[PDB]
Write a protein that binds this ligand. Structure first.
Ligand SMILES: O=C(N[C@@H](Cc1ccc(F)cc1)C(=O)N1CCC(O)CC1)c1cc2cc(Cl)ccc2[nH]1
Ligand SMILES: O=C(N[C@@H](Cc1ccc(F)cc1)C(=O)N1CCC(O)CC1)c1cc2cc(Cl)ccc2[nH]1
Ligand SMILES: *Cc1c(COP(=O)(O)O)cnc(C)c1O
Ligand SMILES: *Cc1c(COP(=O)(O)O)cnc(C)c1O
Ligand SMILES: OC[C@H]1O[C@H](O)[C@H](O)[C@@H](O)[C@@H]1O
Ligand SMILES: OC[C@H]1O[C@H](O)[C@H](O)[C@@H](O)[C@@H]1O
Lengths: 811, 811
């Protein structure tokens, strides 16, 4: 059936009886009243049972061996479903598939019942998840620490072509993968004031909120290692939080609101108090847990030798001043020793350069909520600027530019500057992004401490993003080069010698056609629409953002439609362009773009002259589980952000690994992907970072493009006149206005080159054999983009630990 | 070891391995890091496993056989712990005791870890729990329906002698006994308005709250029957309940607050909207569930033949108009047919006659929250008063007295009148209470429909209240008459022939001494105080209420103290008087009484001259699990409410069954207990109902008693001068003031007779042999107070079903 493992006679028999055991004793059901959800839960428990043993020994192991521990702090962990992932990493997939078959059930149908653990917004959150998988597969003693939101990313509904947000009550039916641990409940403080007494400062009269941990197992790939992802949940103390007795009890929900919902912002900062509370909550509980574990393993001199804390963006940046608070105020270490320790254990990862995404917290907020932390930040700033003054005497302007405190309307703390000053390493997520950080945004810091700056190009895990979602492709690859590539993706290079293999070429093309047929069916099954599986599947799925330019894609789609209407009887390569992604609730322009996409589809999809040559479909509720479905079925991957705006991107790597060709700009990781596959095997177009700068010096004037490109002007006039919105002719006035007068992302500037490039893609598609051979050269060179490579680099160049592919002593 | 069942070799082996299975797979622990709470949970799951099979077949059975179903609606179910109770009813106690012993654990230590399911205030709530146990033991197809409060009765803490309330977060570590069933989630409506259209009225524009059920198994005593207690939990819909996206999500907690906390009022009405919402919530979800089940089993003519709904007090009274709403508005039945059906399926139980406990809801509240129900209530009232007018022509005053609508300051709906009009049966809970209902409070209704009024004297379950909490006494009883009495308490009469048995007399006295020694140890273990186990254990435990007169007990205690101080070297029977119970948070006088008790103990307990002859101890956090501890250790049970105020009482029956003698007034069930044991074997005193009336006609003047009783006057002057409150001399001015000028319960009127009676109790105690022989005559005649008797009466005289002690076909 496939290398989903073996289906042993004894193993299948054991699984079946345990499945029946859980259906009965755990779910209290019998075959006569059990629903598919019951069946899913019986299977989940049966599979979960196989982790317990490994989980206990792995943790037991780390206790005995006492290795250096890696702590990955993130406010997001975009996990998705975990049933299939667990079976894969445990080699149980075929056995469970057989067992359920014999019990008369369809395992695939059961898998669709699991809810996605959508505790993330997009790229940043999914990177943390891929990293967790790689760290376990590489035998690192790593822990993922975050917040257990009871409501993750909202479920997206399209109503009248508009996005509607609906609460993601993912825990409604229960989460079999988490393990509550009330024995490690910790107190977190807020507000209060600072008292300066004889022997040190004291933070008093604070409001207490308890942090209760929930542990989720993270299994490595077939090595018997099971690490932990610890998510904190807010719980109110039962005393004080006890005017009215009834009210006092109902009011407990005020403290517990801290972990209620994930902020739905992607690459956008919103300075709300609740968000700051969430950030301190996760930091305060995590560091107590880290130090407690360390004390078991009081000279904190060896702290950095046993502890590494990785900050995923600046969200958990309060870890720096919190570590100082604990070491100086509680452990009574002298400032300088505490600072040496802090810098040596902390490392920071930057994920974007757009200004609106940078965390700049108003000082009055930190003053009220965390008074002691504000004082420590001021002291850190003081000493840091003294260092700068010494290094660049008289450079008064550099002084204000590098300050962690920004003066102006309202004073603010620049969390990124805080992170650079208190970390021994700072990294970008793609070569171009890391260079841009040194050359622009953090130039002053790089000049001060060049040794701190590094790069760690992102990656994705080949387990979920290949074996799990595309078993067919994984099978034909393994048939030729073996299975060793699953945890050593570089071996994919060996596929280069099959580029002329008539058999391989036919197989690769076959799995893609099967994936497209399956997705096409899913589209009609759960969404009822109908699409032609013979057309080119053009897809752009990611969060809706002006910088990602779903709008540039829209212009091309309209261009295609207009060319068809001009010469109806001319042949054109049929296309099914699918765009999907969620817009943050308060992001007006992004919501306007979603409406534009659905409006274009309303016209195009019902034009008889167009026929089945062009279909515009908006993919509803894009999330991890849906990505696993569309990506393997894609032919063309759209990665068209304005050069210099997408730090790295990861969806791009997912598409490359699954047999889709890429059309994109020289941005983020796109640059390194083309470098690995060869630019001849990539569809690159548009301005490079340098051209964008040149245009900015000159001054970007959209009118110029509108004046010189008839096809462009026709589109804009179609939008303004109401051609795509009959009942509301001026519906899209905002978009047209932005495009013409305030386009920070120069959509028009890349239009001509994009359309031309798209023409070249259509020409290659007309030649199946050659299209497929290029795909093979992409798949064969995607090895570098595995998160196992990324993690091995973080491990060796930042954390100071050696990865290991050694199987743990059985379960 | 005892008739806790057999400890089979195979059974103990099986239990041990399953215990280890759960500790590993369920709790993810190993013997090296498992805490006692883990051990408790492993045992709970092991025992719980033995119910699943029985639960499924019992429910399966009721489906096939299709008997008439009994639905017991209550806003309270005071369950207590359930581990030991489950082992008893399953005959697993000795086997589990052996198994844990061999695993090196103490089962008793593990049992103390379980949290009490305190979803009740006192008597009314505990009656529902005893009833559930009896209904299962009697093979009735019964379902208990209520609300799953996440916070039950508050935990009581004494600070500075004052009561402090603390949230009862009983679900913090999880509840292994409940089973969530999201597949039966039902919608409940609130607010909205009524539209009158062509074919009927419509309730529109309502706010929807979802009701999710949680099922808890209720095992019968060793008959393999397992019934269900279904508790509803409030859940917000994820759409509309989705101004701000974040706010919308945080605001879900407004709808879910409905099931957040139990109102801590005992025999007291508080007309708060949240409470009304809770009442409709449980009624609306329950009736949908009832009708759905009925439709499976559309002529609602047979509805009453298959359905019986028992209303525990007026709390679920909205069931009457809700049943009408559904039948008339949705099922489209004609009014009269719907009314015939409603009356025939509904029955109401009254639990008190004090006016402040009567539910009288303001019309403006029902108008806003349940507009359609208000209309139906008006129509019910209309037709009912027409009936009255026809029966008593011209009796205009009877008309207003019987109205369900009370005019005045604010119009109100008398929920009790609603219940009488819409039920085919109305019952009191003790013979005297039922007579008082007919003679006073509901006299007009009794004259209209005499056939409706009945009595069903309360009872307690002998499983929890004898076998579970007093195995020693249960063992010596069984040694002589067998085990059949456990489900046939009347057989206890056979013990009468052992009243002169020298061996029995010595045994009965022995178990009491052991129980007292054990409790005395527990007191020092968890509360550190020290008490003399040789003294007479004088206890009054129940909710603090003026009508229960903990104050009368206080006066006696002070009298004793004063007599000792007067003649220090005179001998007196040593006593340890223990008073315990919670005061509703807003009940000022009750909280003042708790402070009085602790203040008396502060003086008495530290007076050297008193020595160990008198100790006054206030029992902290009285609840079901504590009752199971004190009751078996008591010698004297205080049931001293003012004649005519305690409807029945049940604590009194618990004490009688466990070998304590009773000192009390001719009130509630006390009357029938003395009647069963013989007044010579009871310590009765004080005014009878008739004497209280006589005093009221005359006019109660406390000053008279103060003027004629020197000992009384001395006490009152001690309270006024600050003798019991040095730092705050006027601390108890409120109590003295009430006692002298506004004592609704005539404490002073029963003082003299009470003290004299107490002297007689002390004299009998001085004669161990005779004290014990009287105890035997009480225990031997307590058979009538088993809830199995009560339930068999409800079954035969109200519900129309026959109980059965037939074992269900194995598990
Ligand atoms: O709670 C039980 N089983 C779990 C089995 C289970 C466990 C985890 C999960 F994610 C889904 C189902 C369950 O259904 N839920 C707990 C977690 C969540 O709140 C949903 C309800 C349970 C079984 C059972 C048997 C008896 Cl006899 C009595 C009470 C019981 N409860
Ligand atoms: O949740 C698990 N077990 C239950 C075992 C259990 C079930 C009911 C109960 F009342 C107490 C304990 C539990 O500890 N809780 C669920 C209910 C409550 O929220 C407390 C935490 C669990 C075991 C386990 C093993 C693995 Cl390998 C992964 C996740 C897991 N979760
Ligand atoms: C991989 C992934 C992303 C990141 O996509 P980019 O195109 O890099 O922005 C976002 N969302 C989901 C659901 C993903 O799987
Ligand atoms: C039995 C019981 C009651 C009822 O006691 P009364 O003396 O009848 O008021 C109250 N609380 C608890 C904990 C009980 O067990
Ligand atoms: O680093 C992980 C991801 O973080 C953010 O989502 C960036 O916008 C994206 O470019 C990057 O791939
Ligand atoms: O009916 C059960 C109980 O209800 C209330 O608590 C009454 O006050 C009490 O007298 C009675 O025993």
């Amino acid at each position: 059936i496939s290398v989903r493992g073996l289906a042993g006679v004894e193993n299948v028999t054991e699984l079946k009886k345990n499945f029946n055991r859980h259906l009965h004793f755990t779910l209290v059901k019998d075959r006569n009243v059990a629903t598919p959800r019951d069946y899913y839960f019986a299977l989940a428990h049966t599979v979960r049972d196989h982790l317990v043993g490994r989980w206990i020994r792995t943790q037991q192991h780390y206790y005995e061996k006492d290795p250096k521990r890696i702590y990955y702090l993130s406010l997001e962990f975009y996990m998705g479903r975990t049933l299939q992932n667990t079976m894969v990493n445990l080699a149980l997939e075929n056995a469970c598939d057989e067992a359920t078959y014999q019990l008369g059930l369809d395992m695939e149908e059961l898998e669709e019942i699991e809810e996605d653990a959508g505790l993330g917004n997009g790229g940043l959150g999914r990177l943390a998840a891929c990293f967790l998988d790689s760290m376990a597969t590489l035998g690192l003693a790593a822990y993922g620490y975050g917040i257990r939101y009871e409501f993750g990313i909202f479920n997206q509904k399209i109503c009248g072509g508009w996005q509607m947000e609906e609460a993601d009550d993912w825990l409604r039916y229960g989460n079999p993968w988490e393990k509550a641990r009330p024995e490690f409940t910790l107190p977190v403080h807020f507000y209060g004031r600072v008292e300066h007494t004889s022997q040190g400062a004291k933070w008093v009269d604070t409001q207490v909120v308890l942090a209760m941990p929930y542990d989720t197992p993270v299994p490595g790939y077939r090595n018997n290692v099971v690490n932990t992802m610890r998510l904190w949940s807010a719980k109110a103390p039962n005393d004080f939080n006890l005017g009215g007795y009834i009210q006092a009890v109902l009011d407990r929900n005020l403290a517990e609101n801290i972990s209620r919902v994930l902020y739905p912002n992607d690459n956008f900062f919103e300075g709300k108090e609740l968000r700051l509370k969430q950030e301190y909550f996760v930091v305060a509980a995590t560091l107590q847990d880290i130090i407690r574990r360390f004390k078991s393993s009081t000279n904190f001199d060896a702290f950095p030798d046993k502890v590494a804390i990785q900050l995923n963006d600046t969200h958990p940046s309060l870890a720096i001043p919190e570590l100082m608070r604990v070491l100086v105020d509680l452990e009574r270490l002298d400032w300088d020793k505490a600072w040496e320790v802090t810098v040596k254990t902390c490392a920071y990862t930057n994920h974007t350069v757009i200004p609106e995404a940078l965390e700049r917290w108003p000082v009055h907020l930190l003053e009220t909520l965390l008074p002691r932390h504000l004082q420590i930040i001021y002291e850190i700033n003081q000493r840091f600027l003294n260092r700068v003054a010494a290094a660049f005497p008289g450079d008064v302007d550099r002084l204000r530019r590098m300050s962690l405190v920004e003066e102006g309307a309202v004073k603010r703390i620049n969390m990124a500057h805080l992170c650079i000053a208190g970390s021994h390493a700072v990294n970008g997520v793609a070569r171009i992004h890391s260079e841009i950080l040194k050359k622009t945004i953090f130039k002053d810091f790089y000049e001060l401490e060049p040794h701190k700056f590094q790069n760690k190009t992102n990656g994705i895990t080949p387990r979920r993003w290949l074996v799990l979602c595309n078993p067919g492709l994984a099978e034909i690859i393994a048939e030729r080069i073996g299975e060793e590539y699953i945890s050593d993706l570089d071996q994919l290079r060996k596929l280069l010698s099959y580029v002329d293999d008539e058999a391989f070429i036919r197989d690769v093309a076959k799995v893609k056609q099967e994936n497209k047929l399956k997705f096409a069916a899913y589209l009609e099954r759960e969404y009822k629409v109908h699409i032609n599986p013979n057309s080119l599947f053009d897809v752009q799925v990611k969060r809706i953002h002006e910088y990602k330019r779903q709008l540039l894609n829209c212009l091309h789609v309209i261009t295609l439609y207009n060319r068809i209407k001009k010469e109806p009887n001319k042949f054109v390569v049929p296309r099914t362009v699918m765009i999907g992604g969620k817009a943050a609730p308060g992001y007006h322009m992004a919501k306007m773009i979603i409406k534009l996409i659905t409006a274009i589809g309303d016209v195009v999809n019902h034009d008889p002259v167009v026929g089945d040559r062009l279909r515009v479909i908006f993919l509803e509720n894009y999330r991890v589980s849906l990505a696993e479905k569309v990506i393997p079925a894609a032919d063309l991957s759209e990665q068209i952000s304005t050069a210099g705006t997408e730090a790295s991107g990861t969806g791009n790597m997912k598409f490359m690994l699954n047999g889709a060709l890429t059309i994109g700009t020289m941005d983020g990781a796109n640059v390194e992907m083309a470098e690995e596959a060869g630019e001849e095997n990539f569809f690159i177009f548009g301005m490079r970072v340098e051209d964008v700068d040149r245009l900015d010096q000159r001054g970007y004037n959209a009118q110029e493009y509108y004046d010189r490109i008839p096809e462009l002007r026709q589109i804009i006039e179609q939008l303004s006149s109401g051609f795509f919105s009959p009942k509301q002719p001026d519906l899209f006035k905002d978009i047209v206005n932005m495009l013409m007068h305030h386009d920070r992302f120069k959509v028009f500037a890349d239009y001509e080159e994009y359309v031309k490039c798209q023409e070249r893609v259509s020409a290659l598609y007309k030649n199946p054999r050659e299209w497929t051979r290029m795909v093979i050269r992409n798949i064969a060179t995607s090895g570098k983009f595995s998160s196992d490579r990324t993690i091995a680099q973080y491990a060796r160049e930042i954390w100071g630990v050696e990865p290991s592919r050694q199987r743990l002593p059985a379960p």
